[PDB]
Every structure is written in structure tokens, then in C-alpha cells.
From a paper:
Notably, numerous cellular neddylated SCFs and some other CRLs have been reported to associate with ARIH1, an E3, to form ‘E3–E3’ ligases in which ARIH1 serves as the ubiquitin-carrying enzyme. We developed activity-based chemical probes that enabled cryo-electron microscopy visualization of steps in E3–E3 ubiquitylation, initiating with ubiquitin linked to the E2 enzyme UBE2L3, then transferred to the catalytic cysteine of ARIH1, and culminating in ubiquitin linkage to a substrate bound to the SCF E3 ligase.
To visualize the TS1 reaction (ubiquitin transfer from UBE2L3 to ARIH1), we installed an electrophile between the catalytic cysteine of UBE2L3 and the penultimate glycine of ubiquitin that captures the catalytic cysteine of ARIH1 depending on native reaction requirements. However, in the E3–E3 platform, the WHB domain of CUL1 and NEDD8 pack against each other, and the Ile44 patch of NEDD8 engages the UBAL subdomain of ARIH1. In the TS1 intermediate, the linker that connects the ARIH1 IBR and Rcat domains—which is displaced by the switch-helix conformational change—is remodelled into a Ub-guided helix that synergizes with the Rcat domain to promote its capturing of the UBE2L3-linked ubiquitin. The Ub-guided helix thus projects the ensuing Rcat domain towards ubiquitin. Catalytically important residues of the Rcat domain grip the extended C-terminal tail of ubiquitin in a β-sheet, which culminates in linkage between ubiquitin and ARIH1.
Author numbering:
A (entry chain U): 1 to 75
B (entry chain N): 1 to 76
C (entry chain R): 21 to 59, 67 to 108
D (entry chain D): 1 to 151
E (entry chain C): 336 to 686, 705 to 776
F (entry chain H): 98 to 164, 184 to 390, 406 to 554
């Protein structure tokens, strides 16, 4: 049960996560690993955006899969 | 008396000086082995840039001490 | 005085060309071409003083009728032996 | 809790000092982390008419910025009808944990007097304001006149 | 019982050649013989006792590969390409024509053994380079044991590595065959041309196959010119377009020196012929006067003059000079020694900071002339650094590119090669 | 050559104090000041040297930000409970600890941490940060953040793209030359992809964005995100000011979202920002070949396994070990040839048809066909007990394939040198 996150600086990293976990907790894990505050991140998988409502299993996140990270500058 | 000048990468230079030898003369003595005209060369000692017209003994240098050498590609 | 009775010399044979690539198969001009190599392979000369293997230039002229270094018309000028 | 200890002394200082631009410092003495206040401008057309502001101090104060909410409506190029202002003195990129809230007050009031048509969240309104300034001094005047408060 | 045998046989063979040490590193015979002995002994061991199961033969082969590729001889000369070189040298030293005549049976047997030691090595291209070089030498100099032996060795190499491996050697051999054929036709066509005074013979090679370079700037004497031109015109007749680039640096003949007192008969190279034929008229030429007429290069002329002066045919102005080491100047006489005498006849008279300097010059000339062309810049930087060193043109281009990406210059907009001063 | 190196986090952290010592040898300032100044110059020694020694200092120091109750908690404390930077402001260590902790644990700002008091901008060194906080995990987080900043800001270092390799490839100067970093991966140091021998980096990017059969997130990224002009990170906007400020680690550069230009003039006084039939067929052909080769290069484990299994099985039927050795070598060459043909197709896409392109697209078809025949030989025709011909066939085939691919690479590189292609 591991997935891959492609960071802004290349540096692909791997996450340990359970299929019942939510995107907010995923963001918290990414924040702990790298340092990006978990509120200007967007995670993109399979060409569709990842909101905060549903979960990885809902989004049909497989195992040993990659999902990208982009910034969410506002204001 | 024998002093040395260190380049930025780390290569070492041996030069003998006379008390009345001038900074420009030292630049030439550098160039006879480094091929760098004195406009590009700069000489560094005690954090202060070595003035062009001065004498090696003015700074009260004693031999052995390194007068660190730095390049400058503009050099006026 | 005369001091000459015998002589044995060594000479290298080579095609009478100025550059050596054949510019079609990119092989050395003296070697075999790209089809005779995957197994009587002479050189042909062009009226513009260009030379290639015979088999390479044959296929090239079979498809397009242009000398492939100078996009001009092509006609045979001297074979090789 | 340190938020409360700081805010009580800051509020006491503001009240004791007295100001010519801030009136009606209304605050719930129990929660004490929310402020309701009335500001009054001087420059037209916003001078005609009073209007109110609500401040929400977050839990982690003064180590996080106090978000400000602009309750009463107003016709300003740099203010949303929902009541959101940008005010770079507060954005999380520059909030320094020593600035007294009155400095925020003067910064906001200076924003009110002087518009910024180059950082707009009402794009068409700001473009028109930067185009034909003369009429909007009346256009916003009616809106404030019918939607301000008693000063 | 497999994994253990491999460890024993590899360990045993390694120290067998360690004993010879440096004595092998210059004598391939002992090295190849030792490897062969170890292999033969343990092949005989696993041939009968172990019934020749696949695993044991696999162990033998793996260990032989291991201890042939790296061992003491490899380490002492510090590379892995010292075993194939030694094998090639052994094969050459076996196929040369020595005083001893090789018996066909034992020759074939020994070549069969060399094939084994070859099939174990792991870099079969260095071996081809060295074998090609040595075969070229001993074919050109007519110094070979048996043409059947040469053909057999090439045939088994082809069997063990394929038609592409041994194409150069096959061409290199058929060339000597065609040369032998063509010389007879020249002799036949020669019945009607009356060759001036000499017995002529030539060996006409190919170009891509043999490892030889063009020539060494020689000016032919007038003695051989008739034969040279007649053969070149004959060759141009039988073929359409073909260009003989004669190379005299490796070619030999025979003199008769019918000027001394006892009718000797010399035997030397073409450079010797040029020099000695020069002295047909007079005997008071110097090094400069010689290079005026023979056009030979200074170093080769010095070598040839020294080798002649080692013999008593030519003598300096001094009589007891140690001609082996004394080097001479362009204004130095050479005297023909008229009284030379040899005890016999038929003599055989033969044998970075630099990058930083690049960048400094680049920026200096740039600020001197802001706008200027690439090739002219190359010339100017070469002039500025001539007293120091001549950096390679790729190195200068590289430093130019590094300085471009370091923001001290940028190629002008729209042109591939034109540099403007970064401001 | 291409001199490079591999390190880990601890060595890449210690090399920082190494560089600090190197520069401070001649600067003669305390370590904190040197670190600040150098970090402002993207860790380039000579730039700092020339900008420090070109004239005045105080302008640089202002350009680098270096030069009774508490005002934060409003409580009284002993004079032993007040500390502050060299700017003059004085606070207490409880507020210091909480401020630094919240900053570096909830904002990620590791290196650019400024003085708390209003209006000040004197940033905080390393020693003070270590001297105030007390937790250990916070300290290690700070170390990790500054190390990541050091790597990303520098242009001689690069994290390995492998999903878990923790290694930086320190090199002397970047030229898109492949390197390997001991985790088993080799990549193009300049673009981060796998090594691509003939094709240039930019065409590889343009082709890999729309690879058209592997990923779709690139379409989203193009359709909804620009890139920061300064730090080059993909940014998605959902605000309204149009006055974007890059909230990266140390790219605090503010600009305009639409024109993507600097914001200082822009919006200041008066400036206002406001495939038919042949193409898809050509793309279809090239992408078909590229995807086929990608599939085959993905299944390379199965090819090794299957040839190994047939290798053993053929060995047990009274066949020795050296045969199956040549078989392994053949497989290796086959894989290399497919790997090169892959990027050769990419190169041959973006290429306008001229004379020197039909030559290339006629050579690569031949190498394609020979690769296919070799792969056809292996599977079936290694069947059984026909070694003496199949071995010859396979050796002849793979030497030919290797020679041809070397010719293709040389053709491409010569064309680049001679400016002979047109797109
Ligand atoms: Zn042919
Ligand atoms: Zn050809
Ligand atoms: Zn032509
Ligand atoms: Zn405090
Ligand atoms: Zn301060
Ligand atoms: Zn790696
Ligand atoms: Zn690349
Ligand atoms: Zn940026
Ligand atoms: Zn714009």
C-alpha cells in the first residue's frame, strides 16, 4: 500500500497510506515529508483534479501509482 | 623574502619580493607565470583590496603569509 | 658506382577519390556496401565528380533520379574496376 | 490565552487614548477575540455616511494574522460585496508578531481614503474608476448615501 | 561437488603462473605453456573421475575464464589486455620462419592448443588488432613459416568467431596472392620493354585492410625512375581507376658498390640507396646538401645517417668519434670512407588552469573588440596563448560555451557565430 | 571526460560549511555573514568575490539584509530573559521559540526568517536559530529545509529522480551528459529524463508532453497552469488580484499572471496588460514505432529470463557453456539496438524532408529489419543440435547490428556539427 508523489523539484517520493485515508490526511503527510503548507497544494491524478470530499478508494487510486503536485497560488 | 599568493580554485604560487617592490611589479611577476594582465588581476590582503600603486612593504607584510589572489574578468 | 641490382617496393592500392564515405550507406568507400555486407562490388563515378558504390547508387536512381549530395540531374560518367 | 492577555491590554490602551477616526469599539467581554467597530472617513464620496467593521482574531494570536471582515456594504474598487479586503499588512507573507492592531487600523483607513485601481477584485469597476473618475465620485456617493450609517 | 571444484581449480591455476612472475611478462612462451598445463591436468581430472557431467565441465570453464582474464601477469603490467597480447605474440613467434624447420603435425597440434587458450579469453577484439598487425608485418617482409599454416590459423579463427571477425585477415591474405599472380604478368609484359638494369618486384596491397600510413615525403632518385614509371603505366592499363600511393619507408633492394677495391655487394633500404647513390659524383656533401637533394625529413635522415656511420662506410671528419651518440648540425661534413673492408661478402647493412586562461583571453579580446567573428577569435586567442599552450579547438569552443552560459557574452541575435560583449 | 560525484544529505550539508570556509578565507567575516551573502548569490564564489570587491560595502549589506515588558506577550521578565539580533530589537525567548517553531513547522520558510518586530527585515542566521529552539524534531526539520534549499538553488547539484534515491549528483558544469548515481539509474543531468543519445533535450520535452498514449495530466497542466518566469514551477491560479507573488521557498518574485512579466512597471501608472490529413498519419507511423519499441524495452526482464531458460535447457542436452555465452552477448546487443532506435524515431519526426534525410530514413529502416531478424533467430532457431551454423548466423548478425547503430549515431552528431538538418 504505497503511492508516488512527483514533487515540484523532481525528487519523486513515496507515501505510505491506506485505501481508507482522505485527501486532507494525504496532504498532511506530504507537508510533513517536504514542507509545503497543506493548503496551496493541488494533487492531480489521471488527468482529473483531486478535491477534498471523497477518498483515494473513491477516486480509484491503485497501488504503486503516481499523482502530481502543483502550486495553488491565489490572491 | 618569500611570500605566496593563492588563486581561487586552490593553485599555489611562490614569489620572492624585495621591500621596495611595488604592487604592479608583483602583478607582473604573477603574469610571468599566470598570463593575466594586471588590469584583471586583483590582490587581496586583510580583507582590503591591495591598492595598485602601493609597495609590498607598506602593508608591513612578512614572508610566508599568503596574499590571496582573485581574478576579475572586467578589470577596467 | 652503379650500385643497383634489385629493388622490391611496396605500394598501396586505393580508389581515385577525394573523400571516402559513399554518402548513402556511410560505409568506408573501400569496404563492402550495405547489401553485399549482409552475406564484385565496384565503384561508379558521377558526371559531377562524385562517387558511390554501384549498388547503393543503383537503388537511389531506381527511386529518385537525383545525385544525393547536390540536388541535380545524374548521369553515369565512369565505372570502376 | 496569551491572545486574551494581549488583547485586553491593547483594547484598554486604545480606549484610554481615544482616536479621531475610530468610534464604537464594541466587543463581547466573554469571547473577547471578536471586535465590531465603526470607522468614519473624511475624503469624498465616502465621507458622507458611516459604516462598520468586524474583526475576528484567530486562536493562535499574535502568532497568526487577524483576518478582518468588512460587514457593511460600500462602493469601493478594492472591496468585495461579501466584505473581503486584501490589505498586505495582514497577509500571512508579511504578518509580524509585534504590530499593534491600531497600525492595522490606520493602514485600512489609508486604504479607504486612497483607492488602488491596480490591485482590484472588482475588475470592471476599477477600470471604469481609472477611466472617468469624475462621475464615480457621485455614483459611489449615492450608494453610500443610501447604504451608510449615522456618523 | 560443483561449487567446490570451481573454487579449487581457479585458486590452483592462479598461483601456477605467479611463480614465473616477471619472467613471463616478457616471455609469452612460458605463460601460455603454464596456462595450457593447468587446463590439461584438470581436464584430464574431470574427464574420467567425474564421468564428464555438465556441472563439472561448467566449473572448469568458468574458473579457466576467471584466472586467464585476471592474474599476476595482468596485475604486474596493470591491465587486462596483457593476456591477449601475450597470446598473439606467442602465435606470431610460433609462425615465424626461424632456423628450425616446424613439422606439419606438431605445428597443427600447437595451433590447435593456441585455439583453446584463445577461446577462453573474454576480449576478442584486442587479440584481432595485435594478430592483424603481426600478420601484416610477416607477410610484407616475406618472413613466414608456412602458407598452409597461415591459412589454417585464419580458417579456425573464422570457425570460432564468424565471417565478420576475420574479413580483414582474409583480404590481407588474398592480396599477397594477387600480388604474386600480377608480378608474373608484369614479367611477361616485360619481355618487350627491356628493364634498364635491375630485377624488379612489387607487392600491391589494399588500402582499408592493411594498417599502414601514407608516406614520408620522399624524392625518388633518377636511377629507379624508368622502372617506377613503367610499372605505374602498366598498372593503370589493366584497371579502370586506381591510384598507387607508393610507400618507400618499408622496401628493400641490393647494391653492388663497384667503386671500392674488392667488389662487395651491399643490401639495404631505399633510404640507404638514396643517400649512397647521392655520392656517385662527389664525396663532400653535408646534411643540408643531402636534404636539398633527397627531401627526406630531418629526424629520419639523422637516424639513417647514424646507422650508416655505425658501419665503416661513412665517417665524420673525426676518426674515433662515438657516432652512436654524437648528434650533428646542418653544417657538418660527411666523408665517404674509400678504404672500407669487410671480412666477407654480401653485407647486411640494416637494423583547469588552462581553461581559466582560455576564458581570460576570451574576455580580454572581447572587451578589446566587442564584435568579432568566431574563427578570427580562435586565431587571436591562439596568438595570445602561443607562449603558454595551444588548447584544442574543441576545448576553446567548450570554454566559449561555458562563458556564454556564465553570462559574460552572448552570440548576436540571428547569427550562429558572432559574439557580442555582455553589458 | 565528464567528472561528477555522488553524495548524501550529510555530505551535501557539510560541503556548505566547506564553501563557507573557502570564501571566508579571503573575506574575513564571521560565518553567519558569509552564509547569508553567499546564499543571496546562488552559491557562486566568484560572483560574490567580484560584487563584494567592486566598490562600496554598505550598499551590498543593505542589499543582503545583514548590517520593561515584552512587546509580544506583554509580561515582565528579568534582563536575562531578553535577546535579539544585531538590529537592536529585544524580545523574550518564549516568544522567540514559539515564533520560530510555528514558522518552520507550519509555513516551511526555512532560510528566509526575519526579525519579528514591525518594519524590520534583518534576517536570522543559523546560530541563533539553533540557540533558541529546544525541540529536536523541529531542529531536524530545519536542517532538511535548508539542505533542500541549498540543492535547489545551486546549479551544480541535482536530486536523483529515482522514487527513493537520496543522492545529489555534484558535477563541475552541466552539458546534458549522462551520469549514474549508484542507485542503479542513469539520467541526463540537464533535463532529468533517461539518457537520449541522438536527440536533443528540447525536442524530447516537446514529444514527451504529448506522448499521446501514456498520460493525460500534461493536457491538464497545459490547459490550466502557466509557469513562474523566475523559478519555473507549474502554478495554478484561483485568486483575482492578478498580482501573483511566487510563494516558493526562495523565489519571492511577484509578477503579472497574464503577460507573465515583471510587476514593477506593469500596472503601476498607465501600462495595462489587457493536423488535417498528412500530419496525423505521419504522427501515427512514428508513434506506432516508438510505442512498439517502448513495449519491447519494458519486457526486457522476460527476454533475459527466456533466453536464460533456453540457455540451461540447451546446455543439459550435451551442449557446453561457451555457446550459451555467445547467446547472452547477442541478447545484450539486441536490447541496446532497440534502445537507440527508440530515440532515433523521435529525432526523425521533427525533421523537414531534404536529401540528407532520405539517407537517414533509409538507413534506420535497414537497421530495424536486421534487429527484427536477429530477434527472430533467437526464439525459434536456438532449438537444438545445430550449433555450428546457428552460432555463426547469430554472431554475424549482431556484429552487423552493432556496427550499423554506431553509424547512425555518428551520422546524427556529424549533422549537428555541420548544420545540415532542417525542421
Ligand atoms: Zn555491393
Ligand atoms: Zn555505399
Ligand atoms: Zn553529385
Ligand atoms: Zn514575549
Ligand atoms: Zn529587527
Ligand atoms: Zn539515484
Ligand atoms: Zn536530456
Ligand atoms: Zn517562482
Ligand atoms: Zn500583464
Amino acid at each position: 500500500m504505497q503511492i508516488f508523489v512527483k514533487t515540484l523539484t523532481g525528487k519523486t517520493i513515496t507515501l505510505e497510506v491506506e485505501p481508507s485515508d482522505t485527501i486532507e490526511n494525504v496532504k498532511a503527510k506530504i507537508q510533513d515529508k517536504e514542507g509545503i503548507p497543506p493548503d496551496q497544494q493541488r494533487l492531480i491524478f489521471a488527468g482529473k483534479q483531486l478535491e477534498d470530499g471523497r477518498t483515494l478508494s473513491d477516486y480509484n487510486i491503485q497501488k504503486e501509482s503516481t499523482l502530481h503536485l502543483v502550486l495553488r497560488l491565489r490572491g | 623574502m618569500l611570500i605566496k599568493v593563492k588563486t581561487l580554485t586552490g593553485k599555489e604560487i611562490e614569489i620572492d619580493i624585495e621591500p621596495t617592490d611595488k604592487v604592479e611589479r608583483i602583478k607582473e611577476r604573477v603574469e610571468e607565470k599566470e598570463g593575466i594582465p594586471p588590469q584583471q588581476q586583483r590582490l587581496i590582503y586583510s580583507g582590503k583590496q591591495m591598492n595598485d600603486e602601493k609597495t609590498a612593504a607598506d602593508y608591513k607584510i612578512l614572508g610566508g603569509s599568503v596574499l590571496h589572489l582573485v581574478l576579475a574578468l572586467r578589470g577596467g | 658506382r652503379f650500385e643497383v641490382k634489385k629493388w622490391n617496393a611496396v605500394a598501396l592500392w586505393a580508389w581515385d577519390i577525394v573523400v571516402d564515405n559513399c554518402a548513402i550507406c556511410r560505409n568506408h568507400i573501400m569496404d563492402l556496401c550495405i547489401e553485399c555486407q549482409a552475406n564484385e562490388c565496384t565503384v561508379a563515378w558521377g558526371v559531377c565528380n562524385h562517387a558511390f558504390h554501384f549498388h547503393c547508387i543503383s537503388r537511389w536512381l531506381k527511386t529518385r533520379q537525383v545525385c544525393p549530395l547536390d540536388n541535380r540531374e545524374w548521369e553515369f560518367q565512369k565505372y570502376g574496376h | 490565552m496569551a491572545a486574551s492577555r494581549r488583547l485586553m491590554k491593547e483594547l484598554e490602551e486604545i480606549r484610554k487614548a481615544g482616536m479621531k477616526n475610530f468610534r464604537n469599539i464594541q466587543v463581547d467581554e466573554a469571547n473577547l477575540l471578536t471586535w465590531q467597530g465603526l470607522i468614519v472617513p473624511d475624503n469624498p464620496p465616502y465621507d458622507k455616511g458611516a459604516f462598520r467593521i468586524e474583526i475576528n482574531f484567530p486562536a493562535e494570536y499574535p502568532f497568526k494574522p487577524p483576518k478582518i471582515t468588512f460587514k457593511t456594504k460600500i462602493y469601493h474598487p478594492n472591496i468585495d460585496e461579501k466584505g473581503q479586503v486584501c490589505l498586505p499588512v495582514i497577509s500571512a507573507e508579511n504578518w509580524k508578531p509585534a504590530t499593534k492592531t491600531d497600525q492595522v487600523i490606520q493602514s485600512l483607513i489609508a486604504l479607504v481614503n486612497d483607492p488602488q485601481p491596480e490591485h482590484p477584485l472588482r475588475a470592471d469597476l476599477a477600470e471604469e474608476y481609472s477611466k472617468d473618475r469624475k462621475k464615480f465620485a457621485k455614483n459611489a456617493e449615492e450608494f453610500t448615501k443610501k447604504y451608510g450609517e449615522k456618523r | 561437488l560443483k561449487k567446490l571444484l570451481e573454487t579449487h581449480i581457479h585458486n590452483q591455476g592462479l598461483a601456477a603462473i605467479e611463480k614465473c612472475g616477471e619472467a613471463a611478462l616478457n616471455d609469452p612462451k612460458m605463460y601460455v605453456q603454464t596456462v595450457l598445463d593447468v587446463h590439461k591436468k584438470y581436464n584430464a581430472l574431470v574427464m574420467s573421475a567425474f564421468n564428464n557431467d555438465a556441472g563439472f565441465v561448467a566449473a572448469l570453464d568458468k574458473a579457466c575464464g576467471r584466472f586467464i582474464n585476471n592474474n599476476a601477469v595482468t596485475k604486474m603490467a596493470q591491465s587486462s589486455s596483457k593476456s591477449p597480447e601475450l597470446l598473439a605474440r606467442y602465435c606470431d613467434s610460433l609462425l615465424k620462419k626461424s632456423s628450425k624447420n616446424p613439422e606439419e603435425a606438431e605445428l597443427e597440434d600447437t595451433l590447435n592448443q593456441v585455439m583453446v587458450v584463445f577461446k577462453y579469453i573474454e576480449d576478442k577484439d584486442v587479440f584481432q588488432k595485435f594478430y592483424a598487425k603481426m600478420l601484416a608485418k610477416r607477410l610484407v617482409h616475406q618472413n613466414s613459416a608456412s602458407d598452409d599454416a597461415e591459412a589454417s590459423m585464419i580458417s579456425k579463427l573464422k570457425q570460432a568467431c564468424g565471417f565478420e571477425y576475420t574479413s580483414k585477415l582474409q583480404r590481407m591474405f588474398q592480396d599477397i596472392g594477387v600480388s604474386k599472380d600480377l608480378n608474373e604478368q608484369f614479367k611477361k609484359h616485360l619481355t618487350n620493354s627491356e628493364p634498364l638494369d635491375l630485377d624488379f618486384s612489387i607487392q600491391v596491397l589494399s588500402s582499408g585492410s592493411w594498417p599502414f600510413q601514407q608516406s614520408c615525403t620522399f624524392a625518388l632518385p633518377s636511377e629507379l625512375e624508368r622502372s617506377y614509371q613503367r610499372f605505374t603505366a602498366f598498372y593503370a592499363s589493366r584497371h579502370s581507376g586506381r591510384k598507387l600511393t607508393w610507400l618507400y619507408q618499408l622496401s628493400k633492394g641490393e647494391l653492388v658498390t663497384n667503386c671500392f677495391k674488392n667488389r662487395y655487394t651491399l643490401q639495404a633500404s631505399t633510404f640507404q640507396m638514396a643517400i649512397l647513390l647521392q655520392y656517385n659524383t662527389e664525396d663532400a656533401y653535408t646534411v643540408q646538401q643531402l636534404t636539398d637533394s633527397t627531401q627526406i625529413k630531418m629526424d629520419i635522415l639523422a637516424q639513417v645517417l647514424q646507422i650508416l656511420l655505425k658501419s665503416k662506410l661513412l665517417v665524420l671528419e673525426d676518426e674515433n668519434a662515438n657516432v652512436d651518440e654524437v648528434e650533428l648540425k646542418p653544417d657538418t661534413l660527411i666523408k665517404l670512407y674509400l678504404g672500407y673492408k669487410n671480412k666477407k661478402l654480401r653485407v647486411n647493412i640494416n637494423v583547469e588552469d588552462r581553461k581559466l586562461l582560455i576564458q581570460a583571453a576570451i574576455v580580454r579580446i572581447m572587451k578589446m573588440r566587442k564584435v568579432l567573428k568566431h574563427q578570427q577569435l580562435l586565431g587571436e586567442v591562439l596568438t595570445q596563448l602561443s607562449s603558454r599552450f595551444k588548447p584544442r579547438v574543441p576545448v576553446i569552443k567548450k570554454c566559449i560555451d561555458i562563458l556564454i552560459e556564465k553570462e559574460y557574452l552572448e552570440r548576436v541575435d540571428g547569427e550562429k557565430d558572432t559574439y557580442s560583449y555582455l553589458a | 571526460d565528464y567528472r561528477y560525484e555522488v553524495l548524501t544529505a550529510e555530505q551535501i550539508l557539510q560541503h556548505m560549511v566547506e564553501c563557507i570556509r573557502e570564501v571566508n578565507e579571503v573575506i574575513q567575516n564571521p560565518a553567519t555573514i558569509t552564509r547569508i551573502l553567499l546564499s543571496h548569490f546562488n552559491w557562486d564564489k566568484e560572483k560574490l568575490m567580484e560584487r563584494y570587491f567592486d566598490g562600496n560595502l554598505e550598499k551590498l549589506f543593505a542589499e543582503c539584509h545583514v548590517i520593561m515588558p515584552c512587546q509580544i506577550c506583554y509580561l515582565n521578565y528579568p534582563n536575562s530573559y531578553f535577546t535579539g539580533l544585531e538590529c537592536g530589537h529585544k524580545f523574550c525567548m518564549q516568544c522567540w521559540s514559539e515564533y520560530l517553531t510555528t514558522k518552520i513547522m507550519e509555513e516551511g520558510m526555512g532560510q528566509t526568517i526575519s526579525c519579528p518586530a514591525h518594519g524590520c527585515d534583518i534576517l536570522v542566521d543559523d546560530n541563533t536559530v539553533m540557540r533558541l529552539i529546544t525541540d529536536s524534531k523541529v531542529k531536524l526539520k530545519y536542517q532538511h529545509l535548508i539542505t533542500n534549499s541549498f540543492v535547489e538553488c545551486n546549479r551544480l547539484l541535482k536530486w536523483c529522480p529515482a522514487p527513493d534515491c537520496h543522492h545529489v549528483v555534484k558535477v563541475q558544469y552541466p552539458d546534458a551528459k549522462p551520469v549514474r548515481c549508484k542507485c542503479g539509474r542513469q539520467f541526463c543531468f540537464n533535463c532529468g529524463e533517461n539518457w537520449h543519445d541522438p536527440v536533443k533535450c528540447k525536442w524530447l520535452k516537446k514529444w514527451i508532453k504529448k506522448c499521446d498514449d501514456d498520460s493525460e495530466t500534461s493536457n491538464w497542466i497545459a490547459a490550466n497552469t502557466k509557469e513562474c518566469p523566475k523559478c519555473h514551477v507549474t502554478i495554478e491560479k484561483d485568486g483575482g488580484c492578478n498580482h501573483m507573488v511566487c510563494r516558493n521557498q526562495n523565489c519571492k518574485a511577484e509578477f503579472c499572471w497574464v503577460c507573465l512579466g515583471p510587476w514593477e512597471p506593469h500596472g503601476s501608472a498607465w501600462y495595462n496588460c489587457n493536423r488535417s490529413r498528412a500530419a496525423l498519419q505521419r504522427y501515427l507511423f512514428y508513434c506506432n514505432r516508438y510505442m512498439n519499441h517502448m513495449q519491447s524495452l519494458r519486457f526486457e526482464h522476460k527476454l533475459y529470463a527466456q533466453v536464460k531458460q533456453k540457455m540451461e535447457e540447451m546446455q543439459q542436452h550435451n551442449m557446453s557453456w561457451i555457446e550459451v555465452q555467445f547467446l547472452k552477448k547477442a541478447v545484450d546487443v539486441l536490447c541496446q539496438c532497440r534502445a537507440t532506435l527508440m530515440y532515433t524515431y523521435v529525432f526523425a519526426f521533427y525533421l523537414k524532408k531534404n536529401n540528407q534525410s532520405i539517407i537517414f530514413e533509409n538507413n534506420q529502416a535497414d537497421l530495424e529489419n536486421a534487429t527484427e531478424v536477429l530477434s527472430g533467430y533467437l526464439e525459434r532457431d536456438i532449438s537444438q543440435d545445430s550449433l555450428q551454423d546457428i552460432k555463426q548466423k547469430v554472431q554475424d548478425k549482431y556484429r552487423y547490428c552493432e556496427s550499423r547503430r554506431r553509424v547512425l549515431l555518428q551520422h546524427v552528431h556529424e549533422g549537428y556539427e555541420k548544420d545540415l538538418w532542417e525542421y
